[PDB]
Amino acid sequence: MENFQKVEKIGEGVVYKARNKLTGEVVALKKITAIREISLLKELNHPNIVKLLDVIHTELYLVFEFLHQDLKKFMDASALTGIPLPLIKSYLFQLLQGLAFCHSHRVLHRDLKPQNLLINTEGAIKLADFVVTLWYRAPEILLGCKYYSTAVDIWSLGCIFAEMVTRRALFPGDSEIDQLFRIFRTLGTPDEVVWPGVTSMPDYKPSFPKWARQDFSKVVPPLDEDGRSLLSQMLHYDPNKRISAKAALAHPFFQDVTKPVPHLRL
Ligand SMILES: Nc1nc2ccc(C(=O)c3c(F)cccc3F)cn2c1C(=O)c1ccccc1
Numbered sequence: 001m002e003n004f005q006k007v008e009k010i011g012e013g014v015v016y017k018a019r020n021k022l023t024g025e026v027v028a029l030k031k032i033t034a035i036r037e038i039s040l041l042k043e044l045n046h047p048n049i050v051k052l053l054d055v056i057h058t059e060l061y062l063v064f065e066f067l068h069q070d071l072k073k074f075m076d077a078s079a080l081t082g083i084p085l086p087l088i089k090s091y092l093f094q095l096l097q098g099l100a101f102c103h104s105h106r107v108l109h110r111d112l113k114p115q116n117l118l119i120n121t122e123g124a125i126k127l128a129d130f131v132v133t134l135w136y137r138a139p140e141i142l143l144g145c146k147y148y149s150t151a152v153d154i155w156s157l158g159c160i161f162a163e164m165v166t167r168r169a170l171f172p173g174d175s176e177i178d179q180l181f182r183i184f185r186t187l188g189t190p191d192e193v194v195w196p197g198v199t200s201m202p203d204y205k206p207s208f209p210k211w212a213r214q215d216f217s218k219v220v221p222p223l224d225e226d227g228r229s230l231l232s233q234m235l236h237y238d239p240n241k242r243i244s245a246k247a248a249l250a251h252p253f254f255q256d257v258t259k260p261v262p263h264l265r266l
Helices: 033-042 071-078 084-105 150-167 176-187 225-234 247-248 252-256
Strands: 002-012 014-020 026-031 052-055 061-063 117-121 125-127
Touching: 002 026, 002 084, 033 052, 052 176, 071 150, 084 117, 084 125, 084 150, 084 247, 084 252, 150 225, 150 247, 225 252
Parallel strands: none
Antiparallel strands: 002 014, 014 026, 026 061, 052 061, 117 125
């Protein structure tokens, strides 16, 4: 709309950085029943959720608060030394608060990934944007569950947690079956013992190869036992045994959480 001045295209809808030719405000402008669905999102305000400032419907643009960097760019920029654990823990804690908030309002993100988590110079991290990467997709979605729950967001976050720690994607699948098999090779092929009802899932196949589960100590070293304990609960196969965001916030891992400030090059 004529109320903004596209400053730069910051990412392919397409996201532009823009200045409100009126309020001088700089914002992120995203060019995209869905109406009222998005208006409700405009009421979902939390410090760890990128603020949806306005919805301009004209012949659909979403006006968001502008943050200078996403986690993917930050992880890439910290690949040599990695993100300090104190900061990893602070980010995980804040994202869990954001999810606890979203989930309490029966709202799911459904597609969390490093590129959708934005950070600022003060140490805050926020959930944004509530081929397409499958690396963070929960197994129940991959198995064709049509009515998945808030637990799909915990799975995705557990994945990002593992990636921040190891500096390598946990399950970099490049197809739906490769994604599923990478999860199986690491966490063990699921069965009725660990996931009641799993064999009845739409895309479950008795012909799936049976891989043995690997120890977490080999998956996210050098994360401490509290960290591995939390991650394990965030990656349970059964969406119902998977830890909720609220309970996760009470895990011993966060007993000594702080809010460090990252060093960013804007
Ligand atoms: N500086 C920024 N401020 C914001 C504010 C909101 C969204 C936002 O809501 C959002 C979106 F609209 C689409 C995809 C991912 C998102 F996080 C993205 N950004 C950015 C980005 O730099 C960026 C990061 C990744 C992809 C594209 C732009």
